[PDB]
Paper text:
A Mg2+‐dependent protein flavin mononucleotide (FMN) transferase (FmnB; UniProt: LMRG_02181) in EET is responsible for the transfer of electrons from intracellular to extracellular by hydrolyzing cofactor flavin adenine dinucleotide (FAD) and transferring FMN. FmnB is a flavin transferase belonging to ApbE family; it hydrolyzes flavin adenine dinucleotide (FAD) and converts flavin mononucleotide (FMN) to pheromone lipoprotein (PplA; UniProt: LMRG_02182), and divalent cations are required this process. Here, we report a series of crystal structures of apo‐FmnB and FmnB complexed with substrate FAD, three inhibitors AMP, ADP, and ATP, revealing the unusual catalytic triad center (Asp301‐Ser257‐His273) of FmnB. Notably, the structures of FmnB in complex with distinct inhibitors, together with biochemical assays, revealed that all three inhibitors indeed inhibited the activity of FmnB by occupying the binding site of the FAD substrate.
For FmnB‐ADP, the phosphate groups of ADP form salt bridges with Lys190 and His273 and a water‐mediated hydrogen bond with Thr305. Similarly, the Mg2+ ions near the ADP coordinate Asp301, Ala187, Asn216, and the phosphate groups as well as water molecules. Furthermore, while FmnB‐ADP is similar to FmnB‐AMP, the binding pocket for ADP is smaller, and there are no significant conformational changes in Met49 and Phe142. In particular, Arg262 is more distant (4.3 Å) from the β‐phosphate group of ADP, possibly due to spatial repulsion between Arg262 and the phosphate group. Remarkably, the structures revealed that the key residue Arg262 of FmnB was profoundly affected by ADP but not AMP or ATP. Moreover, considering the effect of Arg262, only the presence of ADP causes Arg262 to move away from the center of the cavity. Curiously, ADP exhibited a stronger inhibition ability than AMP and ATP. In summary, these charge repulsion and space constraints result in the strongest inhibition of FmnB enzyme activity by ADP compared with that by AMP and ATP.
Numbering used by the authors: 37 to 358
């Protein structure tokens, strides 16, 4: 193991992405990782006017005909439908018509009018996604429907990147896709990795504290990471598919700790829909999954798996308990 890792940085999917590998001799696995990330993102993205992705193709054939898709996309949509069901539809990968409408995080983001929202809500229904395992085809049942895999793409890509790493016998590494961290192995000095917990009020990278972790995903969401501002008001990018407006409750930010990064992303949105007290309860129903919640009043909560493990460093915040 090396003290200083092999490191590469890029800007993809609208975020800074960095990979670090500490195993001597494996510098070329960084390119294998970024290659994989780029291949997955090209299949998944809807927001490239120059290329038609598999997701784009599914969307343009809504109500028309099923679409042959690759194993990567078929798999990701299957998992998205499970998270959709498991969430009670507060998370729904068919939110596409609604997220296209606000298009938060792009220079043309806007607050649509209620009448425009009302027109797209009847299109949001994960149950209208028709999978065929035999054919490996995906069919949206009604015209107008749009898939949006945004809320699970970085988790899936992280896990797929780790698979690339393990295939090349990488043992110690850090994968950072902006709002997703995976830490593999331990620090070369033998300690667990000290994972920063994001300060939801400050730019990405600022932290309120550290959580020691090894071989774990940490996924972070917050009310200010991608948002729109108009008339002195803020609209973040995690939308209520039943309302058309961003979830409004006491959560400022949440970091979810799990074995798989996709479960991190997956569980993120149903957690936002439930608030602090309800989101902790939801997370307590999932074995091997925990969370640190940060409320709008700057108080910090741990689920049972994590109780007493977060090390708070920012005095503006305070540990609290239900
Ligand atoms: N309720 C929802 N269910 C499913 N997907 C959503 C929902 N709201 C927004 N999305 C899509 O998923 C993305 C949110 O992903 P998330 O992981 O929470 O943010 P980040 O990209 O900062 O990690 C949005 O940008 C949008 O494309
Ligand atoms: Mg997510
Ligand atoms: Mg994410």
């Amino acid at each position: 193991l090396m003290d200083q890792p092999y490191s590469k940085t890029d800007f993809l999917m609208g975020t800074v992405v960095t990979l670090k590998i500490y195993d001597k001799g494996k510098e070329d696995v960084l390119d294998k990782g970024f290659d994989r990330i780029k291949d997955l993102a090209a299949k998944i993205t809807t927001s490239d006017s120059e290329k038609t992705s598999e997701v784009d193709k599914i969307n343009e054939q809504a109500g028309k005909k099923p679409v042959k898709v690759s194993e990567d996309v078929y798999y990701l949509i299957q998992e998205g439908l499970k998270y959709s069901e498991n969430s009670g539809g507060s998370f729904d990968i068919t939110i596409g018509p609604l997220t296209s409408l606000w298009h938060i995080g792009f220079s043309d983001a806007r607050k649509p009018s209620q009448a425009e929202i009302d027109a797209v809500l009847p299109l949001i229904n994960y149950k209208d996604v028709k999978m065929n395992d035999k054919d490996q085809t995906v069919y949206l049942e009604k015209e107008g429907m749009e898939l949006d895999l945004g809320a699970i793409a970085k988790g899936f890509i992280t896990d797929e990147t780790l698979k690339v790493f393990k295939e090349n016998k990488v043992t110690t590494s850090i994968i950072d896709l902006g709002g997703n961290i995976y830490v593999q192995g331990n620090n070369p000095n033998g300690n667990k990795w000290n994972v920063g917990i994001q300060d939801p009020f400050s730019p990405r990278g600022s932290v309120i504290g550290k959580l020691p972790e090894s071989n774990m995903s940490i996924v972070t969401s917050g009310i200010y990471e991608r948002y729109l501002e108009v008339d002195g008001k803020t609209y973040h990018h995690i939308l209520d598919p039943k309302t058309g407006y961003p979830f409004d409750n006491d959560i400022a930010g949440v970091s979810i700790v799990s074995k798989k990064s996709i479960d991190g992303d997956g569980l993120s949105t149903a957690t936002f829909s439930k608030g602090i007290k309800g989101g902790m309860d939801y997370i307590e129903q999932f074995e091997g999954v925990d969370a640190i919640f940060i409320s709008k009043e700057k108080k910090v909560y741990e689920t049972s798996g994590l109780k007493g493990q977060f090390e708070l460093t920012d005095k503006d915040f305070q540990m609290d308990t239900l």
